Amino acid sequence: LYFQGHMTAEVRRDSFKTFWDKYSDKPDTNSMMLNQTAQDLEASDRADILSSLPHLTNKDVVDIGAGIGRFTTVLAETARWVLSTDFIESFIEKNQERNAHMGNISYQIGDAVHLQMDEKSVDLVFTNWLMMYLSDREVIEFLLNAMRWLRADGYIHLRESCSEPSTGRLKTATMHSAVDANPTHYRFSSLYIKLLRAIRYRDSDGKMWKFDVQWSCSVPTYIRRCNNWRQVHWLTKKVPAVGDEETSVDDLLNLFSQIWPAEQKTWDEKLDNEKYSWTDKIFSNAIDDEVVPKNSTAYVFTPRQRSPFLHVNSHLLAEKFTCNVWNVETKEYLYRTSLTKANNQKDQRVRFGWNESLSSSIDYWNQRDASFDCMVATELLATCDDESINSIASIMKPEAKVVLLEPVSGIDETSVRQRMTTCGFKNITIVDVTQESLNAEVSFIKDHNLDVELSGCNYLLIKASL
Numbered sequence: 227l228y229f230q231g232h233m234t235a236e237v238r239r240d241s242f243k244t245f246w247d248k249y250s251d252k253p254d255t256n257s258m259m260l261n262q263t264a265q266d267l268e269a270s271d272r273a274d275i276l277s278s279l280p281h282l283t284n285k286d287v288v289d290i291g292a293g294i295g296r297f298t299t300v301l302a303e304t305a306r307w308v309l310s311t312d313f314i315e316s317f318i319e320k321n322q323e324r325n326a327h328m329g330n331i332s333y334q335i336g337d338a339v340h341l342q343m344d345e346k347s348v349d350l351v352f353t354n355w356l357m358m359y360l361s362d363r364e365v366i367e368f369l370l371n372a373m374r375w376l377r378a379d380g381y382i383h384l385r386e387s388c389s390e391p392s393t394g395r396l397k398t399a400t401m402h403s404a405v406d407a408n409p410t411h412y413r414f415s416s417l418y419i420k421l422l423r424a425i426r427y428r429d430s431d432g433k434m435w436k437f438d439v440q441w442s443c444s445v446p447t448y449i450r451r452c453n454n455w456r457q458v459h460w461l462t463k464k465v466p467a468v469g470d471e472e473t474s475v476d477d478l479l480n481l482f483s484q485i486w487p488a489e490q491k492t493w494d495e496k497l498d499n500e501k502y503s504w505t506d507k508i509f510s511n512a513i514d515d516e517v518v519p520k521n522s523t524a525y526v527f528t529p530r531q532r533s534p535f536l537h538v539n540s541h542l543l544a545e546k547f548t549c550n551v552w553n554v555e556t557k558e559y560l561y562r563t564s565l566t567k568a569n570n571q572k573d574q575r576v577r578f579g580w581n582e583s584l585s586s587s588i589d590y591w592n593q594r595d596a597s598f599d600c601m602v603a604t605e606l607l608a609t610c611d612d613e614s615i616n617s618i619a620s621i622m623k624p625e626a627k628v629v630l631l632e633p634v635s636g637i638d639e640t641s642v643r644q645r646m647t648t649c650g651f652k653n654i655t656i657v658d659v660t661q662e663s664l665n666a667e668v669s670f671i672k673d674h675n676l677d678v679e680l681s682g683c684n685y686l687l688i689k690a691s692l
């Protein structure tokens with residue numbers, strides 16, 4: 227019965243510690259994952275996350291919210307040193323017991339909100355399921371702190387339950403109470419990505435920094451076993467932001483708390499009822515089972531520059547050709563809507579990732595020695611340069627076939643061939659699909675009652691191979 231006893235940051239801070247207090251009697255993987263059968267998922271999930279990290283030889287790592295330390299255990303195998311923290315005492319105690327055989331782990335009991343360390347004191351800030359237990363202001367404050375603590379070239383890993391609990395709404399799998407309110411913040415995936423990209427931090431030497439969000443990916447184990455695409459994680463690098471201006475906590479908070487979630491909601495309203503893509507009819511006359519063999523993996527790239535509706539229906543692709551699909555998105559809000567679709571369809575063959583550019587996705591897949599079976603893309607030539615397009619082959623099998631739908635103004639077929647021939651393509655054919663696209667786009671808009679105009683561009687449908 228004290229001042230603002232229902233709403234202060236401390237009361238809200240303590241509501242999370244109280245929630246986790248309920249599990250301190252069970253310092254086990256069930257609590258860490260809030261899943262009655264966490265044994266089924268734990269090792270595969272941990273491997274999904276740990277295999278996404280950079281090598282840690284000679285590096286200092288801080289694992290914040292480490293709990294019983296299932297990541298700490300493996301992180302300290304290669305890192306020079308790991309600081310492992312959690313605000314639940316028994317969890318840290320269980321952490322110290324499991325890891326009694328190791329000698330390069332420091333332990334701390336405390337709230338992540340109050341954690342303090344020297345500038346440029348770590349190389350990796352590792353978290354997994356933590357931001358969702360902080361307020362919007364605390365998330366921003368946490369990220370500015372990570373920025374302070376990281377050395378240049380340093381990384382931060384984050385993984386959050388986005389939009390819904392890991393166990394969905396609501397699985398008997400959950401360890402959540404069916405009657406108690408759940409205090410957890412299930413934010414949209416797009417908000418995390420945008421916040422990370424927005425941050426500009428000036429250090430004590432007066433140097434500016436920004437985050438390079440290397441990727442956004444769904445945790446594979448949660449798709450395969452929980453039909454959940456919204457367990458989202460990101461690897462993010464601290465890099466110089468020459469000439470940029472600082473972003474304050476208040477300036478970031480306005481965006482993160484009000485502006486962005488609002489903008490996301492308008493995109494949900496436009497895209498969530500999408501029954502098919504207007505491009506389906508167009509791609510139908512260029513994609514066959516010679517382009518997409520049965521059980522192959524297709525690489526799909528949809529930047530959605532000219533229009534949010536210009537993309538590839540990856541679900542229809544996977545359905546009609548019995549293939550797996552990786553679809554790259556570059557627009558945060560539109561990537562989120564693809565995750566929404568993925569969760570409702572529950573076709574595990576279809577996967578999405580967010581990257582800043584084509585080059586970003588190519589690096590990711592290069593590092594993983596991927597060789598996709600084909601490419602289907604909208605706006606490839608329109609949005610990417612020769613250098614990036616030429617590097618697509620480094621993630622394609624020999625003779626992989628491609629199909630491109632391209633918005634153009636004047637039709638310059640000779641020039642289009644020369645770009646693609648310069649970027650390593652062969653057997654190039656070009657078909658003008660402007661009238662077909664005009665018909666299909668209008669049919670699609672009227673059918674979905676979108677009060678919008680046509681993209682208004684001409685279209686080429688291109689097929690080639692490498």
Ligand SMILES: Nc1ncnc2c1ncn2[C@@H]1O[C@H](CSCC[C@H](N)C(=O)O)[C@@H](O)[C@H]1O
Pocket residue numbers: 242246257258259290291292293294295296297311312313314317336337338339353354355356359
């Ligand atoms: N503000 C905070 N400071 C420190 N630890 C926190 C915290 N908020 C939540 N936690 C801890 O974060 C953990 C959440 S569950 C996930 C545990 C671990 N990251 C893993 O994936 O296995 C719990 O251990 C909880 O106690």
Ligand SMILES: CCCCCCCCO[C@@H]1O[C@H](CO)[C@@H](O)[C@H](O)[C@H]1O
Pocket residue numbers: 505506509510513514515516538539540542543545546547
């Ligand atoms: C994203 C573009 C959607 C294209 C789907 C259109 C219908 C595809 O039709 C497919 O054609 C194949 C012939 O090669 C058959 O083997 C498949 O059984 C059939 O589903």
Ligand SMILES: CCCCCCCCO[C@@H]1O[C@H](CO)[C@@H](O)[C@H](O)[C@H]1O
Pocket residue numbers: 521522523550551552574575576577595596597598599
């Ligand atoms: C569903 C999408 C997730 C899988 C992404 C993996 C990247 C491509 O993986 C590739 O898949 C091919 C199978 O067609 C294999 O033959 C290749 O060896 C493999 O590199």
Ligand code: NA
Pocket residue numbers: 388389413414415416456562565
């Ligand atoms: Na989401």
